[PDB]
Design a protein around this ligand. Structure first.
Ligand SMILES: OC[C@H]1O[C@H](O[C@H]2[C@@H](O)[C@H](O)[C@@H](CO)O[C@@H]2O)[C@@H](O)[C@@H](O)[C@@H]1O
Ligand code: CA
Ligand code: CA
Ligand code: CL
Ligand code: NA
Ligand code: NA
Length: 258
């Protein structure tokens, strides 16, 4: 046939072609989240957009290394050092450091999250940008684990609106990865999600992540169509554009026939 038929029942993911100046990396916004609040982050509305109704703490731009690996301090006999969670023991010590005198249950201040000084123990963050596939095919995004709650969304009208990266969050709960902390306990059902992407189109990407206490962990990866995996460092794949709500042609509803 002269032309491709298109994905069935307009099933292609919406993408974008922003015409402005591209910037490397994602924007990270930080919002207040209460220490030891084990319920707010279990609501889909909160993780999709309600986080932005809490106080905005600040932001950092241009971030390409997007995984989270926050370790609380151990105040030890030889000084204060971050403790890998698997090395914590007893009530409590950190392997190779002895007993720790400090509480696992208080807020801690650090620049560990993207250089931004905040409380990684208790915070919500929103990562936004556009994913640029170099290859047409199936991409599988993953979280290796989630501590405490997280979502990943891909696509125009799902992550955010084309050419409108900096706007308040949209209300879609059609997450690509639903890593929301269950009300009962541990292990959302599925922490991978696959998206079919066409090379050279910009796909809106949003990650919302929350920690309520102590350790924070979100190892982000993507499996490319060629079978290789990109983990943590998304340089060359993720970009930002300043809003341009005037760019009439920015939205590509069906990259399968554009
Ligand atoms: O899954 C909840 C929480 O579990 C673990 O935190 C422990 C401790 O560090 C906290 O102070 C108390 C607060 O009541 O909870 C647990 O005993 C960690 O895996 C933590 O990261 C996680 O959020
Ligand atoms: Ca829309
Ligand atoms: Ca935690
Ligand atoms: Cl020890
Ligand atoms: Na860790
Ligand atoms: Na430390």
């Amino acid at each position: 046939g002269l032309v491709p038929r298109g994905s069935h029942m307009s099933g292609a993911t919406e993408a974008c072609l922003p015409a402005g100046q591209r910037k490397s990396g994602m924007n990270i916004n930080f919002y207040q989240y209460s220490l030891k609040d084990s319920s707010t982050y279990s609501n889909a509305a909160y993780m999709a957009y309600g986080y932005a109704s809490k106080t905005k703490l600040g932001s950092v731009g241009g971030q390409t290394d997007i995984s989270i690996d926050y370790n609380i301090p151990c105040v030890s006999s030889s000084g204060t050092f971050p403790c890998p969670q698997e090395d914590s023991y007893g009530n409590w010590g950190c392997k190779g450091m002895g007993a720790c005198s400090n509480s696992q249950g208080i807020a801690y201040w650090s620049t560990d999250l993207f250089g931004f000084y905040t409380t990684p123990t208790n915070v919500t963050l929103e990562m936004t940008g556009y994913f640029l596939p170099p290859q047409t095919g199936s991409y599988t995004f993953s979280f290796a684990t989630v501590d405490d709650s997280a979502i990943l969304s891909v696509g125009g009208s799902i992550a955010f609106e084309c050419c409108a990266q900096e706007q308040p969050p949209i209300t879609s709960t059609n997450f690509t990865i639903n890593g929301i902390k269950p009300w009962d306990g541990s292990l959302p059902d599925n922490i991978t999600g696959t998206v079919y992407m066409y090379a050279g189109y910009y796909y809106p990407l949003k990650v919302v992540y929350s920690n309520a206490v102590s350790w924070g962990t979100l190892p982000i990866s993507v499996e490319l169509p060629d079978g290789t995996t990109v983990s943590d460092n998304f340089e060359g794949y993720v970009y930002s554009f300043d809003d341009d709500l005037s760019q009439s042609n920015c939205t590509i509803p069906d990259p399968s026939i554009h």
